Structure 1
Amino acid sequence: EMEKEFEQIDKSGSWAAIYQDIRHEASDFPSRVAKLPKNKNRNRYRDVSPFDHSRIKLHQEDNDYINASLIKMEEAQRSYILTQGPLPNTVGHFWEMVWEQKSRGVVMLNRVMEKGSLKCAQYWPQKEEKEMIFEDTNLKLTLISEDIKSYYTVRQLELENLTTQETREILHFHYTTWPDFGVPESPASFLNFLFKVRESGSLSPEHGPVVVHCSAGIGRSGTFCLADTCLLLMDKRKDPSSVDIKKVLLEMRKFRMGLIQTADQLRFSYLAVIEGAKFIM
């Protein structure tokens, strides 16, 4: 059982050591499309690339590239698109991907500015009456409503395909209180946030995969998907303690590199799953 494994690693202070064995065992697949010269300004970080096998393709004939990965968890029947925070020049691509994949939710785990630098473009409207048009991808986005809480904001958005005049409602879940350094002290507000996303229907199989991002789409984004998948597997299995968080992480790392960036994120993921298991048993 993970709770005992937790106390063992904690007591022994072996978090950096567990984390290194995960790094060592992690999959390495080609990422040739990401590294083409024409895609250099579509990537926020030169060392964070989607694998060719799992990358999301835009349906535009010119250049189909976006820094985004499909993570397919077969046993849990959950899919996620993990992506970087969009760049000034990829905001239109981001919304095209949301449209093309039939996503119902966007989960944002960073602030636009952290540590005095921009981590992400302002890719949604700030006021009802000031909508955004993306000329490159022929989409219009309107803020319908905004519910600001202590730890997170939920926004209702309308996305319109200007080409066909179809509209969809998108939910934007913005976790606003992840600290600039390290991880939250308690997983309570993170779990509350994750149950809010679940309750919305955004993670359900009747929609396209949820789009999850932080700045790189690997650290905080990683923790989100890992916690959701582990809790779902504990509901589904005859024996809940058969769920090994290290094995789940390694399976997720076949689809996108670097998921969980620090030993502290790993520790936090264990704590989130262990605490969430109480609200599920």
Structure 2
Amino acid sequence: MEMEKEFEQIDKSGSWAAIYQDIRHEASDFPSRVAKLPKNKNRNRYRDVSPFDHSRIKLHQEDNDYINASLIKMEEAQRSYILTQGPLPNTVGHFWEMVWEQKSRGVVMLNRVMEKGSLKCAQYWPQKEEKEMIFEDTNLKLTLISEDIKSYYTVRQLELENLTTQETREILHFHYTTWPDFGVPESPASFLNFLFKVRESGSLSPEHGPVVVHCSAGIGRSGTFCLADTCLLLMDKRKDPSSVDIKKVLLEMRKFRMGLIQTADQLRFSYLAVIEGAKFIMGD
């Protein structure tokens, strides 16, 4: 069923809450035993948001391999994403270790450091060229190379250096800065523009490791980003795009991380983003 028609039918009936609860009820439940070990309590931002054991990212160290991060592998779309929480003061070194070990090219950030008067994630990247950051626990150095500030997003060039081998890589930081403190954006235009900028960079492409995507918990805004990307890509892949079922794509992604899309308003916004994905694509 063509999604703009499914969309108008749900809107006219005001049944967003009922669709959303059906998804919550059918979503996968897998064990998260490593996340709940007492040694890992200070590595988790939220007690109710954990990575599944089967899909968790492992740090390449013998001490403690744990980070709150999941590999989302979309087989038909041929895309992979790592979804993670906003780093904590004690996990900033783990975060950059993961970026290094997984060979990621891009980091996508969908939150501000402070929202609603509280801290949503650590200041994990340098704000001035001449004041670099050293992570002594993981032996990495991070330098700001350049910054491009636009109305709805900022793009940064960073240099990550493995101090053990003296190898360096360029990491692109894509920071969406205008998601509102409450609710979802009124138009998906600036979000879609942002997604197209990440794609243009090469960050989502198979010649690199998976993109790292985060918000505060790494399930809501982060879920919307990967759901919209996978949906529009599948429209160019299939002989009939009308066959792309956003609810079925979301349940597939929820096999790899719990809780993706946190509200009925985010579900509606993700439908809207994929639907309004038409404009600045096929037709006009």
1:203-259 deviations in Å (ceiling 9; x for gaps): 000000000000000000000000000000011100001000000000000000000
Q: Does 1:101 align with 2:102?
A: yes
Following TM superposition, by how much is the alpha carbon of 1:177 offset from its aligned partner in structure 2, in angstroms? 0.1
Q: Which runs of 5+ in 2 are unaligned?
A: none
Report the secondary structure of 1:52's partner residue.
Answer: coil
Please give the secondary structure, in 2, of the residue aligned with 1:32: coil
1:267 maps to 2:268: yes
Question: What pairs up with 1:136-215 in 2 under 5 angstroms?
Answer: 136-215=137-216
Distance, in Å, in 2 between the alignment partners of 1:200 and 1:168 is 15
- Tell me the percent identity: 100
Distance in 1 (CA, whole Å) between partners of 2:279 and 2:179 is 23
Contact preservation (8 Å) 1:91, 1:123: yes
Distance 1:270 1:80 in 2: 20
Q: Deviations over 1:19-67 (max 9, x none)?
A: 0000000000000000000000000000000000000000011000000
TM-score (norm 1): 1.00
In structure 2, the residue matched to 1:35 is: 36
Which moves more between the two structures, 46-55 or 271-280? 271-280
Report SS of the residue matched to 2:233.
Answer: helix
Report the 3-state secondary structure (helix = DSSP H, G, I; strand = E; otherwise coil) of the residue aligned with 1:53.
Answer: coil
TM-score (norm 2): 0.99
Return the offset for 1:279.
2.5
CA contact (8 A) 1:140 1:160 kept: yes
Offset at residue 280 of structure 1 (A) = 2.6
CA contact (8 A) 1:235 1:280 kept: no
Deviation at 1:278, TM superposition (A): 3.2
Q: Distance in 2 between matches of 1:279 and 1:148?
A: 23
Distance, in Å, in 1 between the alignment partners of 2:70 and 2:157 is 24
TM superposition outliers: structure 1 runs of 4+ over 2 Å = 277-280
Q: How many residues in Structure 1 have an aligned counterpart in Structure 2?
A: 281
**Mapped partners of 1:236, 1:139: distance in 2:** 39
What is the aligned partner in structure 2 of residue 71 from structure 1? 72
CA distance in 2, matches of 1:117, 1:154: 24
Is the 1:34–1:67 Cα contact (8 Å) retained in structure 2?
yes
Q: Do the aligned partners of 1:141 and 1:157 also contact (CA within 8 Å) in 2? A: yes
The answer to whether the 8 Å contact 1:107/1:172 transfers is yes
Q: Deviations over 1:114-153 (max 9, x none)?
A: 0000000000000000000000000000000000000000
Find the residue that maps to 2:35 and give its secondary structure: helix
The CA deviation string for residues 67-101 of structure 1, in whole angstroms up to 9 with x for no partner, is 00000000000000000000000000000000000
Deviation at 1:277, TM superposition (A): 2.7
Specify every segment of 5 or more residues in structure 1 that has no aligned partner in the other structure, as ranges.
none
